[PDB]
Design an enzyme around this catalytic site. Structure first.
Site, PDB file in Angstrom:
ATOM      1  N   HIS A 268      23.168  29.779  69.977  1.00 33.53           N
ATOM      2  CA  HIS A 268      21.915  29.167  70.409  1.00 33.53           C
ATOM      3  C   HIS A 268      21.816  27.694  70.023  1.00 33.53           C
ATOM      4  O   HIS A 268      20.994  26.975  70.606  1.00 33.53           O
ATOM      5  CB  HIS A 268      20.706  29.955  69.888  1.00 33.53           C
TER       6      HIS A 268
ATOM      7  N   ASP B 230      25.336  35.860  69.283  1.00 35.44           N
ATOM      8  CA  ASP B 230      24.886  34.519  68.900  1.00 35.44           C
ATOM      9  C   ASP B 230      25.913  33.780  68.038  1.00 35.44           C
ATOM     10  O   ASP B 230      25.620  33.319  66.940  1.00 35.44           O
ATOM     11  CB  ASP B 230      23.540  34.607  68.187  1.00 35.44           C
TER      12      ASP B 230
END
EC number: 3.4.21.7
Lengths: 14, 246
Positions: free
Chosen positions: B58, B101
């Protein structure tokens, strides 16, 4: 309610 | 003059980021600051070899272009970088293919490995950190009024096994098997905004092993709300493949 811990945070309704 | 992974050349402060302490400078030599081309620190990362930095996926959503990013190695200050810090442009971005992630940055030139810039060690594939294991999280993130803003901070936190962390009163089913939890149920100490992508490391025998990548939380340092980290061991095979093929 989840927020990813970047600047700025990326946040979600939960 | 070589330096094995996982072995700091300045011993970390004990310290039994919100809460915690300011690290001894250069005691976490794999810690990266990730920045935009003209911007300030916005995420962390972990050096895992001279050409490769592991971060959170992210942290790359502002731009899909590698030229948008640069890595600062060997730093202690968030803003006033020391004379000897290495600043290296990113040349490639590789996101984990099942949408977890975690991401790899290839550096445009190899980091020079010194007493202040040393990679972390990767864990064995699929290793599960045991409940209550004391680990360390580091970064330059928000402190929510605790001391140490603008300096590299650390916190010593126990791992909370997923089955416990997923209970209704805690994180209520949110945590995946490819994640792990760490923190005190009382709250007060946590990674926070700006710490994403940085390391969670656990000492094993004589060195530190990278076990987590700072990812998300329900706020920071709240009681009954431990922080969530990508479980590095579930991605070691993928990481090795990317480094071998690129």
């Amino acid at each position: 309610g989840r927020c990813y811990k970047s600047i700025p945070p990326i946040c979600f309704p939960d | 003059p070589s330096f094995d992974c996982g072995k700091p050349q300045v011993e970390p402060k004990k310290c039994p980021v919100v809460g915690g302490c300011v690290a001894h400078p250069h005691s976490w030599p794999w810690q990266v600051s990730l920045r935009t081309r003209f911007g300030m620190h916005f995420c962390g990362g972990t050096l895992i070899s001279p050409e490769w930095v592991l971060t959170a996926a992210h942290c790359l959503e502002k731009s899909p272009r590698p030229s948008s990013y640069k890595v600062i190695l060997g730093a202690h200050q968030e803003v006033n970088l020391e004379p000897h810090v290495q600043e290296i442009e990113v040349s490639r971005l590789f996101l984990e293919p099942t949408r977890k992630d975690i991401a790899l940055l290839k550096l445009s030139s190899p980091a020079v490995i010194t007493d202040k810039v040393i990679p972390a060690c990767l864990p064995s594939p699929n290793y599960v950190v045991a409940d209550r294991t004391e680990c360390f999280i580091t970064g330059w993130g928000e402190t929510q009024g605790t001391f140490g803003a603008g300096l590299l901070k650390e916190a010593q936190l126990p791992v909370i096994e997923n089955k416990v962390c997923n209970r209704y009163e805690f994180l209520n089913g949110r945590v995946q098997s490819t994640e792990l939890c760490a923190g005190h149920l009382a709250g007060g100490t946590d990674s926070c905004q700006g710490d994403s992508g940085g390391p969670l490391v656990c000492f094993e025998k004589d060195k530190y092993i990278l076990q987590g990548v700072t990812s998300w939380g329900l706020g920071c340092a709240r009681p009954n709300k431990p922080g969530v980290y990508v479980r590095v061991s579930r991605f070691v095979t993928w990481i090795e493949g990317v480094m071998r093929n690129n």
